[PDB]
Amino acid sequence: GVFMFTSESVGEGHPDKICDQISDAVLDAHLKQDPNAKVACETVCKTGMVLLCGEITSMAMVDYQRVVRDTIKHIGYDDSAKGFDFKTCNVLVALEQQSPDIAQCVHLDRNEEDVGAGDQGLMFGYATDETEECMPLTIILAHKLNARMADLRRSGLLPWLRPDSKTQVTVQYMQDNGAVIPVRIHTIVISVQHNEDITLEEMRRALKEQVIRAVVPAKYLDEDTVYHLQPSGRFVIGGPQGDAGVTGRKIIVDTYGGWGAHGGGAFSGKDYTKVDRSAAYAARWVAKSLVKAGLCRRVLVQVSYAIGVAEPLSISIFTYGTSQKTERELLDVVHKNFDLRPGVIVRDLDLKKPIYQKTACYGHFGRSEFPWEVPRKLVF
Amino acid sequence: GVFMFTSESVGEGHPDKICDQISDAVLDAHLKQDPNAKVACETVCKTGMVLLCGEITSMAMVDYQRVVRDTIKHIGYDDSAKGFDFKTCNVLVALEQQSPDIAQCVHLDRNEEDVGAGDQGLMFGYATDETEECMPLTIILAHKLNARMADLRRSGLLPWLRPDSKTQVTVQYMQDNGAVIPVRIHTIVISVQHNEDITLEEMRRALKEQVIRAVVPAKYLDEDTVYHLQPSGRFVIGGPQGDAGVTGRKIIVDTYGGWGAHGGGAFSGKDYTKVDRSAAYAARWVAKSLVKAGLCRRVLVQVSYAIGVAEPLSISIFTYGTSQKTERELLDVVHKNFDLRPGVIVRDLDLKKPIYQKTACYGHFGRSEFPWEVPRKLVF
Numbered sequence: 001g002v003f004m005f006t007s008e009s010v011g012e013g014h015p016d017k018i019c020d021q022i023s024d025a026v027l028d029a030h031l032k033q034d035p036n037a038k039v040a041c042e043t044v045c046k047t048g049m050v051l052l053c054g055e056i057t058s059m060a061m062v063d064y065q066r067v068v069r070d071t072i073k074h075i076g077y078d079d080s081a082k083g084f085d086f087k088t089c090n091v092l093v094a095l096e097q098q099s100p101d102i103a104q105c106v107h108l109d110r111n112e113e114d115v116g117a118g119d120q121g122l123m124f125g126y127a128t129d130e131t132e133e134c135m136p137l138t139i140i141l142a143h144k145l146n147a148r149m150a151d152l153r154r155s156g157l158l159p160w161l162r163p164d165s166k167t168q169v170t171v172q173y174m175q176d177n178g179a180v181i182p183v184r185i186h187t188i189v190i191s192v193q194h195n196e197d198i199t200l201e202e203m204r205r206a207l208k209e210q211v212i213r214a215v216v217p218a219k220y221l222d223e224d225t226v227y228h229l230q231p232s233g234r235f236v237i238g239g240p241q242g243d244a245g246v247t248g249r250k251i252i253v254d255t256y257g258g259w260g261a262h263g264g265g266a267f268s269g270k271d272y273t274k275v276d277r278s279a280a281y282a283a284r285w286v287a288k289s290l291v292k293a294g295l296c297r298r299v300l301v302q303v304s305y306a307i308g309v310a311e312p313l314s315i316s317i318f319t320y321g322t323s324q325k326t327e328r329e330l331l332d333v334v335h336k337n338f339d340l341r342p343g344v345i346v347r348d349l350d351l352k353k354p355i356y357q358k359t360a361c362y363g364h365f366g367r368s369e370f371p372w373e374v375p376r377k378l379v380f
Numbered sequence: 381g382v383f384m385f386t387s388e389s390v391g392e393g394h395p396d397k398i399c400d401q402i403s404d405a406v407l408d409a410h411l412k413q414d415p416n417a418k419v420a421c422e423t424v425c426k427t428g429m430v431l432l433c434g435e436i437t438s439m440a441m442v443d444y445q446r447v448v449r450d451t452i453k454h455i456g457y458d459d460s461a462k463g464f465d466f467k468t469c470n471v472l473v474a475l476e477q478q479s480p481d482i483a484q485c486v487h488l489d490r491n492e493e494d495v496g497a498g499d500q501g502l503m504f505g506y507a508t509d510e511t512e513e514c515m516p517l518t519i520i521l522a523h524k525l526n527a528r529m530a531d532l533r534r535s536g537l538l539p540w541l542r543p544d545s546k547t548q549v550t551v552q553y554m555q556d557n558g559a560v561i562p563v564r565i566h567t568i569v570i571s572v573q574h575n576e577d578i579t580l581e582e583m584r585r586a587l588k589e590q591v592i593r594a595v596v597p598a599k600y601l602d603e604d605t606v607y608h609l610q611p612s613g614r615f616v617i618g619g620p621q622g623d624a625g626v627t628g629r630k631i632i633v634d635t636y637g638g639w640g641a642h643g644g645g646a647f648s649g650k651d652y653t654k655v656d657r658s659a660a661y662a663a664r665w666v667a668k669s670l671v672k673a674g675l676c677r678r679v680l681v682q683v684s685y686a687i688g689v690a691e692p693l694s695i696s697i698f699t700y701g702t703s704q705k706t707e708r709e710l711l712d713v714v715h716k717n718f719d720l721r722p723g724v725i726v727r728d729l730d731l732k733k734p735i736y737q738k739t740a741c742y743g744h745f746g747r748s749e750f751p752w753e754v755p756r757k758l759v760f
């Protein structure tokens with residue numbers, strides 16, 4: 001019953017991911033001074049331009065030129081030869097206050113515990129026992145390939161590497177009563193921006209031997225694995241010069257790589273009152289807690305909200321046939337162990353801390369440092 | 381075994397959907413003069429501003445001020461009292477040629493049939509026999525609620541309505557050997573921008589009696605259905621004035637409302653060489669053809685590509701246990717009946733025709749006018 005499943009990831013210099021990182025750097029900058037800042041920052045990037053736009057109500061005093069240029073510098077775009085330079089790009093800021101019609105409904109006059117959902121929406125959380133981080137192997141490997149290239153770039157071991165990169169991993173799985181077991185790597189794609197000096201054959205050899213073989217467990221690779229390495233043959237123009245970037249255009253990279261499900265909302269640039277983020281984090285937290293408790297091997301959780309209403313409108317659990325308990329029993333477990341109002345989630349998961357720029361590349365899930373990745377011990 | 385599932389939709393004046401419609405109006409304008417235009421148009425909107433950015437290589441000569449302002453006019457934003465006016469907003473254009481490093485790999489010198497995938501990526505198609513359009517009931521109803529409000533607005537029957545709107549529908553389902561059967565409407569949310577004259581109680585009564593009851597089959601509604609109608613109590617500030625909008629931030633509204641799966645790519649603003657769009661359309665087409673052929677009741681199809689390579693890297697079929705044939709047999713059926721190279725998809729689905737602005741609101745799927753919604757008769 002073998003099947004293929006593909007996931008992709010992108011590196012820190014991918015233009016959409018640049019925007020996610022800048023949006024969350026702005027959020028972090030506000031939260032460091034005003035833990036209750038209301039932030040909805042969209043970032044757009046294209047040749048020579050970063051535009052910040054959206055809605056912020058905050059007591060913080062933030063140097064947006066500094067925050068943006070510091071983020072671009074850290075990513076590695078510091079010269080016109082690379083197509084983008086934090087020293088000389090245009091930074092445009094079009095930031096306004098949050099609509100008062102929204103504020104009066106969501107949070108004005110309310111105790112923090114009672115804050116309403118910042119919008120309507122649906123969110124999903126997912127977990128799978130196929131890896132120790134409870135994530136799909138496809139997306140984890142895709143992230144790790146990009147992170148390895150960034151390490152080799154920053155260390156100087158491969159000086160021809162530039163920050164813009166994309167990876168894609170196809171894994172063959174067998175199924176086991178609703179659970180999924182990875183069996184082998186079927187195909188890997190890597191494209192990474194490079195300078196003019198290096199030759200194509202050298203690049204492909206380095207991506208195989210210093211990237212792929214350093215990251216992918218050898219038991220999954222064999223002589224029939226397909227490798228598309230620098231498949232375009234030339235990737236000198238890159239970053240925002242090659243492709244426009246926008247916040248919230250990598251939402252499947254950010255989450256489960258196509259597994260589970262997604263409700264549509266972007267994460268980056270948004271404070272905790274935006275349930276698109278906080279409730280997706282909470283749903284991941286619930287799903288991972290269910291799997292770690294031995295209640296299932298695979299689980300999808302849906303929650304939904306209405307603007308201004310603190311309590312979820314609906315909660316659903318799907319275990320793909322991998323639980324002995326029924327989904328109505330699991331729902332009982334969830335109601336007895338979690339309170340999914342946004343004003344409680346913020347306390348359980350410490351969502352006012354300025355840690356969001358860390359989440360904006362290499363995935364929001366699967367990384368044990370974050371509070372939604374620490375399972376709650378369940379009573380049942 | 382009853383469960384809840386929620387989907388949402390937005391109306392034509394929602395700021396993210398404004399950008400999708402403008403991006404596809406630009407694509408249509410180019411395709412009317414140059415059927416082979418290469419288009420990757422991102423649109424950003426915020427108070428008083430439309431910014432077009434991205435990459436276009438085309439022989440067409442397009443009046444971007446006219447195209448943008450005509451689109452905003454048709455949506456209905458024609459006065460500062462509504463928060464946005466096509467006559468007086470700022471239109472900024474930052475459009476460059478497609479990267480030559482991409483062009484040499486994707487299409488230069490190649491016959492149309494052999495054009496390579498414009499990017500790497502994964503795409504999904506989904507279909508379900510629960511409605512005659514083979515779509516989830518939740519997302520269809522959510523779309524229809526917004527379309528009904530737009531009709532009542534444009535006819536003058538509810539003159540206090542403005543273009544920005546959001547809907548959300550929670551349905552209770554039972555399952556039937558992997559298939560899903562809608563049973564009742566559990567919750568409906570509607571928020572719509574309004575003028576200052578109308579009272580809250582009048583608005584809520586009109587949304588129930590002239591919108592919901594005109595659109596939702598009465599057999600699904602009962603005395604216990606929950607209604608959150610204008611739940612914020614005041615929604616006068618709206619459109620781009622209330623919330624920044626960006627192309628490709630409604631990808632789950634655009635597709636299956638959280639059902640099936642999504643590979644991450646946005647649709648609007650992209651010509652057929654962008655497999656994010658053409659291969660997702662083709663996968664929907666395959667999935668719907670499988671269901672209409674009686675081969676399954678529910679099906680998810682995954683495909684993936686590498687930049688420059690015409691043939692898919694992987695294809696997967698999941699029937700949720702609703703097919704008598706195995707998924708390997710169904711894969712055989714798909715390989716015998718479809719050719720999923722982008723240069724063949726463009727011919728089968730007529731993807732050079734300038735019909736894309738129609739797809740940019742109310743969903744890309746479930747509408748029989750589009751070629752990917754006309755099932756292919758299968759040999760098997």
Ligand SMILES: C[S@@+](CC[C@H](N)C(=O)[O-])C[C@H]1O[C@@H](n2cnc3c(N)ncnc32)[C@H](O)[C@@H]1O
Pocket residue numbers: 014015016164165166191192232233234235236237238239242243244419420435436478479481482498499687
């Ligand atoms: C292929 S571009 C998307 C299409 C583009 N907007 C256009 O005009 O055709 C998307 C991503 O692919 C990567 N990319 C850019 N140039 C590339 C190249 N020459 N070869 C391989 N990948 C490239 C970059 O990560 C970029 O953000």
Ligand SMILES: C[S@@+](CC[C@H](N)C(=O)[O-])C[C@H]1O[C@@H](n2cnc3c(N)ncnc32)[C@H](O)[C@@H]1O
Pocket residue numbers: 039040055056098099101102118119307394395396544545546571572612613614615616617618619622623624
């Ligand atoms: C709630 S806003 C998103 C959050 C916003 N960016 C902020 O600063 O909090 C998202 C959408 O909700 C809708 N909306 C805007 N104002 C609203 C209001 N006062 N009541 C209900 N819905 C509203 C509009 O469709 C808007 O695009």
Ligand SMILES: [K+]
Pocket residue numbers: 243244245420422434
């Ligand atoms: K783009």
Ligand SMILES: [K+]
Pocket residue numbers: 040042054623624625
């Ligand atoms: K927004």
Ligand SMILES: [Mg+2]
Pocket residue numbers: 016244245249
């Ligand atoms: Mg993109």
Ligand SMILES: [Mg+2]
Pocket residue numbers: 119121264265266276
């Ligand atoms: Mg949202």
Ligand SMILES: [Mg+2]
Pocket residue numbers: 396624625629
């Ligand atoms: Mg949005």
Ligand SMILES: [Mg+2]
Pocket residue numbers: 499501644645646656
């Ligand atoms: Mg894409």
